[PDB]
Design an enzyme around this catalytic site. Sequence first.
Site, PDB file in Angstrom:
ATOM      1  N   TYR A   1     -10.884   2.102   4.838  1.00  0.00           N
ATOM      2  CA  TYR A   1      -9.658   1.883   4.064  1.00  0.00           C
ATOM      3  C   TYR A   1      -9.907   0.804   3.018  1.00  0.00           C
ATOM      4  CZ  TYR A   1      -4.684   0.848   3.158  1.00  0.00           C
ATOM      5  OH  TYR A   1      -3.455   0.651   2.586  1.00  0.00           O
TER       6      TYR A   1
ATOM      7  N   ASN B   1      -8.883  -0.905  -1.132  1.00  0.00           N
ATOM      8  CA  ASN B   1      -8.215  -0.953  -2.424  1.00  0.00           C
ATOM      9  C   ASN B   1      -9.230  -0.680  -3.515  1.00  0.00           C
ATOM     10  OD1 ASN B   1      -5.828  -1.718  -1.250  1.00  0.00           O
ATOM     11  ND2 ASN B   1      -6.085  -3.907  -1.675  1.00  0.00           N
TER      12      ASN B   1
ATOM     13  N   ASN C   1       6.192  -9.260   6.510  1.00  0.00           N
ATOM     14  CA  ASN C   1       5.075  -8.422   6.920  1.00  0.00           C
ATOM     15  C   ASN C   1       4.921  -8.531   8.435  1.00  0.00           C
ATOM     16  OD1 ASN C   1       2.690  -6.978   7.113  1.00  0.00           O
ATOM     17  ND2 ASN C   1       1.411  -8.656   6.362  1.00  0.00           N
TER      18      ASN C   1
ATOM     19  N   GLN D   1     -10.870  -5.289  -0.196  1.00  0.00           N
ATOM     20  CA  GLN D   1     -10.418  -6.070  -1.336  1.00  0.00           C
ATOM     21  C   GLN D   1     -11.438  -6.148  -2.434  1.00  0.00           C
ATOM     22  OE1 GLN D   1      -8.894  -9.432   1.808  1.00  0.00           O
ATOM     23  NE2 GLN D   1      -9.483 -10.214  -0.236  1.00  0.00           N
TER      24      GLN D   1
ATOM     25  N   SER E   1       0.754  -1.235   0.000  1.00  0.00           N
ATOM     26  CA  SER E   1       0.000   0.000   0.000  1.00  0.00           C
ATOM     27  C   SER E   1       0.798   1.307   0.000  1.00  0.00           C
ATOM     28  CB  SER E   1      -1.002  -0.024   1.137  1.00  0.00           C
ATOM     29  OG  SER E   1      -2.019  -0.945   0.786  1.00  0.00           O
TER      30      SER E   1
ATOM     31  N   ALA F   1       1.826  -3.265   3.010  1.00  0.00           N
ATOM     32  CA  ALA F   1       2.051  -4.688   3.212  1.00  0.00           C
ATOM     33  C   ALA F   1       1.566  -5.535   2.054  1.00  0.00           C
ATOM     34  CB  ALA F   1       1.366  -5.160   4.486  1.00  0.00           C
TER      35      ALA F   1
END
Length: 358
Positions: free
Chosen positions: A147, A149, A340, A117, A61, A315
């Site tokens: 948050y 993607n 990670n 996701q 990210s 990550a």
Amino acid sequence: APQQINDIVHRTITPLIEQQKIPGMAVAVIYQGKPYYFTWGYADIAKKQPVTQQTLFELGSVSKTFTGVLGGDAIARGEIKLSDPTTKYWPELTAKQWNGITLLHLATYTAGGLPLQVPDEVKSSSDLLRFYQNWQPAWAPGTQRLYANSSIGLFGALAVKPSGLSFEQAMQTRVFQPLKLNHTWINVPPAEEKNYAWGYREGKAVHVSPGALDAEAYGVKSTIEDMARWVQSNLKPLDINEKTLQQGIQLAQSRYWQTGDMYQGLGWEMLDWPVNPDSIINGSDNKIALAARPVKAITPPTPAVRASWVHKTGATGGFGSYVAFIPEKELGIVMLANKNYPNPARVDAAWQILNALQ
Ligand SMILES: *[B]([O])([O])C1=[C][C]=C(C2=[C][C]=C(B([O])[O])[C]=[C]2)[C]=[C]1
């Protein structure tokens, strides 16, 4: 490098690597506008390849910062406006829940609950459209931050449409090339594979898997040297020649929404400096960073504040990265590891290092 920087970096990173069992690590400290590099361990455990200043790491990210800036560049170029409706750039998106959802919302995770996701089954252009047409908002736009993607990744794809360039081509031409990030990639070329570190998950060597909107949300790989150059460009955008890129960098550091004591920029997140260590440390933990939170609009957005702690965690399955800088202090750090490990440990170490440097 000054013995002072050397001591604080080593005093902090050594126990970090040991407690987290980090296989390889590269660190860059930008002090008074100059980079100092450090490396430890392995890029590839099996082949005994050490981490060097040329080792490529998956940024995860932290890639969202490149996307926020590329988007800012498009805005400065006058190709898009954050106030435009998402449908202005994707007319095929006709479902009524999209009315009122602007590019700002996508860029800032405030569209109303788009998921972290994009579903794995979504792997086609038609599949992407279908997914977005069927998605049901849990909240009205501009009310809650989640948050995701699927939010900024879409902002990324839509943002380059007027240019007629593909996302990778626009990123290269408009961001990587002008800033001399010549060892930073969305797709690492064969000639550079020898430098591509393996990530490690539960002991196994792994690399990030392909996915919808991966380029736009978490697909950049880079070296500690280029990442240091990225931090410098973000610390002093006025030093950048290309007008719109300088402006794009500034736009990505503007404060659009506030959550607790964190402000959402385009990709970058910021807090007022000085900051409370526990606040950025505990806040970076995913129990908070990935949670649904109400947001307060900053009307109008506050221009980039030089007195801020600007940062982003990143990550992938096998990588853990962190970038943080304080414009006011000409100070920054990049921490790239091929494991990670907990975000709190990253922020804690970065804060011990920068705090001790002023
Ligand atoms: B997955 O469906 O396997 C998947 C894809 C992407 C993520 C992801 C990637 C990057 C970030 B960022 O915070 O480093 C968050 C989540 C997770 C899972």
